[PDB]
């Protein structure tokens, strides 16, 4: 909606910011083979209830 409360805006803002890949130097640093962050989401198939 274009008319949203600041409290809903802030919780939506955090899901946008943390929706990221693992950095590549972290993959070298921590010696990882699983490289996908499975807590990511995509707007077409998500149901963020926030």
């Amino acid at each position: 909606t274009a008319n949203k409360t600041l409290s809903r805006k802030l919780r939506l803002a955090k899901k946008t910011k943390t929706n990221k890949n693992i950095p590549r130097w972290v993959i070298a640093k921590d010696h990882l083979k699983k490289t996908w962050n499975y807590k990511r989401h995509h707007w077409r198939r998500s149901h963020l209830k926030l």
């Binding site: 805006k9 802030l10 803002a13 910011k17």
Partner: protein, 70 residues
């Protein structure tokens, strides 16, 4: 940068809990200059952006340069 060369305005990130009157006073005490008007918004990520226009007899180039902004 276009904002400073014309319109004499500097764009800053500030703590979300600050109002326009607290922003004007802070900028005037830290950079030793004269503010004219402050616009603000909260970005889609949660930060606060301030549009700070300096007084019509001050060059924000002279003030952005001393700060490093250029």
């Amino acid at each position: 940068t276009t904002q400073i060369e014309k319109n004499n305005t500097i764009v800053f990130i500030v703590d979300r809990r600050a109002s326009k009157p607290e922003i004007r006073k802070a900028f005037e005490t830290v950079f030793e200059t004269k503010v004219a008007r402050v616009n603000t918004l909260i970005t889609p990520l949660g930060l606060k952006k301030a549009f700070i226009r300096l007084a019509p007899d001050v060059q924000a180039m002279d003030v952005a340069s001393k700060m490093g902004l250029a």
